[PDB]
């Protein structure tokens, strides 16, 4: 019982969670749109 506490409170000391929250919220920032855009772009020019 008392390893397995432990192991839970070691676990959320560190809090992945928070950090795949800053992850992602750092994911979206990113000028993702244009990326899209230039990939169309891309696609166009092949088949025209």
Do not use: P, R, W
Not at 26 to 42: A, T
């Amino acid at each position: 019982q008392v390893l397995m506490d432990k192991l839970v409170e070691l676990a959320h000391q560190y809090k992945l969670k928070e950090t795949i929250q800053k992850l992602s919220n750092v994911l979206q920032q990113v000028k993702i749109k244009d990326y899209f855009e230039k990939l169309v772009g891309f696609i166009d020019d092949a088949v025209k």
